[PDB]
Ligand binder design. Sequence first.
Ligand code: HEM
Ligand SMILES: CNc1cccc(C(=O)O)c1
Ligand SMILES: [Cl-]
Length: 393
Amino acid sequence: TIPHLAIDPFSLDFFDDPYPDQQTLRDAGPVVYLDKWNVYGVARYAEVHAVLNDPTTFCSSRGVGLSDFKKEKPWRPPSLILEADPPAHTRPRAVLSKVLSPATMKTIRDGFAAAADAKVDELLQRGCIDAIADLAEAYPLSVFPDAMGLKQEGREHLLPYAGLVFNAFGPPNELRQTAIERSAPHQAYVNEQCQRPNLAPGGFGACIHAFTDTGEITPDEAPLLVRSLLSAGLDTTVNGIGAAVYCLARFPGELQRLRSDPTLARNAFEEAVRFESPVQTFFRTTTREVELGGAVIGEGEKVLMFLGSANRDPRRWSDPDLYDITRKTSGHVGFGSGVHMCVGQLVARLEGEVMLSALARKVAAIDIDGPVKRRFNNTLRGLESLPVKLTPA
Ligand code: HEM
Ligand SMILES: CNc1cccc(C(=O)O)c1
Ligand SMILES: [Cl-]
């Protein structure tokens, strides 16, 4: 009943151009079986959304990568939030909600915006830049480690550690094997910065530890929740901002609309998250036999959700392959959906908005002027190098 496909969604060929194979996955049926990895797949918006919003049946505590924690040891202690189900998920999630809360964004917005403006001014002095290293990476590195409260020394470990984490959700291919091989120094640095004395007053890390006397988390839970922010909160924004700049470079008509109304900055970033979907995929594990889109899936089965494909599904979106900064983007799954929906989405949107605002006010044109190089990761989609010429307004 279920179609079986040989597509490997973690192969370099797939990463290089995933869109034809994603249509093949959507059009084969609402539920597919991927023979390469012995998992079920859902690539249409409807089934991805249904799976995300039934965490009882499609759980996260057996891992959101290919590995089933019931069968194999996790490569690092499980995340207390990403790799937990309700009710154990609920109180740590509430603490991160409050640490990254609507009210908290007010304390950081002025500094994030000034750093975004300063970066664009600096880049305009050079003219020809790499929008990945010099913008998408440089800007979050200039604000997020400080907002965490990290010391200066050792920050070079942060992007390698996060790349490792996201590669580790994948199957045991060479990308994953090599990441884990190189992991020991980055793991050591990150685990050490998660301890209370190493997190500067007023930053996100200190605020997590401060919640350990409310009864929502205990002191021994705080370091792993800091670990969540250091795993999840930097590389994702790098690829989100990189996606937005790549979109503006490829769709100059949309840059022109953004210049004419810079208040579109927040939605231009949200549309870039839909359009590129920096986090491409996550798994769930079934806790019972279940009917999904007509198919019967047994207990204990891994289900691969194609978030990027769901965000391009023509059953849900008009002209899904167009970048449209006034699109009604509500309901895209680039941040997930439901109880695990990205707890840092307000930080991500703040960074994206203020960077696109700086570009909207200061730049007249963004022209690719060198070879574009893709970066390969089992979970993240983004570029390694994006040479652009920035023309000043
Ligand atoms: C463009 C940037 C980002 C994207 C595309 C993104 C994507 C996602 C997605 C798809 C999920 C859901 C995972 C699932 O359902 O299993 C998620 C959850 C999460 N995100 Fe983000 N994220 C971004 C930025 C951030 C930032 C800036 C932070 C922290 C400062 C962060 C921290 C987290 C955490 C801790 C979770 C787990 C939440 C839970 O399990 O309840 N993320 N993110
Ligand atoms: C998607 N969000 C995410 C990614 C990687 C790690 C974690 C974590 O909680 O460690 C969360
Ligand atoms: Cl680790």
